[PDB]
Design a protein around this nucleic acid. Structure first.
Lengths: 83, 99
DNA sequence: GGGCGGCCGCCC
DNA sequence: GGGCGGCCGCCC
């Protein structure tokens, strides 16, 4: 279940599940903000690689929330776009 | 279905009437040849668009392929290219140096 | 290095 | 014909 407004977002990338912490993402892409079910932590690009999508080189499209690319979440005000 | 419309259009002219959705514009072949990021399509209000900008203006952003969503005489621009009526624009506006 | 636009094959 | 995901290279 997905609440777009929640501080924690369930995300997927190539079938790998994670939990994204918006507060950590807001600190910039060098901060690990996505935690997988074994407790490990990933930056957005690291999670893109983890999900098999290294070649796409765009975590904003490769990482999904409820099936939506994170880019769509940013476009609709649900997720900060890190500067 | 896949064919063009019934209007007469000269496919060899330097300026082509193009359409995307309901939106009409004029494509300047000489500008398209310069590179894909060059504004080459002028709408009637005078505003200018690149091919992908024109696709978005025409309501076809989701298509992500101006070669099929932009038309001339009903024909997709891909058909115009396949038959030598339209150049395929370069990605960049200069010749790459030996690498 | 990273953002992001362009290409186009594959699906529906 | 609408749709969109995988891939990659241009450039800030």
């Amino acid at each position: 279940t997905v609440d777009f407004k929640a501080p924690l977002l369930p995300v997927t990338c190539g079938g790998v599940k994670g939990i994204m912490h918006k507060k950590k993402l807001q600190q910039g892409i060098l901060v690990k903000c996505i935690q997988t079910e074994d407790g490990k932590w990933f930056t957005p690009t690291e999670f893109e690689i983890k999900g098999g999508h290294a070649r796409s080189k765009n975590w904003r499209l490769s990482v999904r929330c409820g099936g939506w690319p994170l880019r769509w979440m940013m476009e609709n005000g649900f997720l900060p776009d890190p500067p």
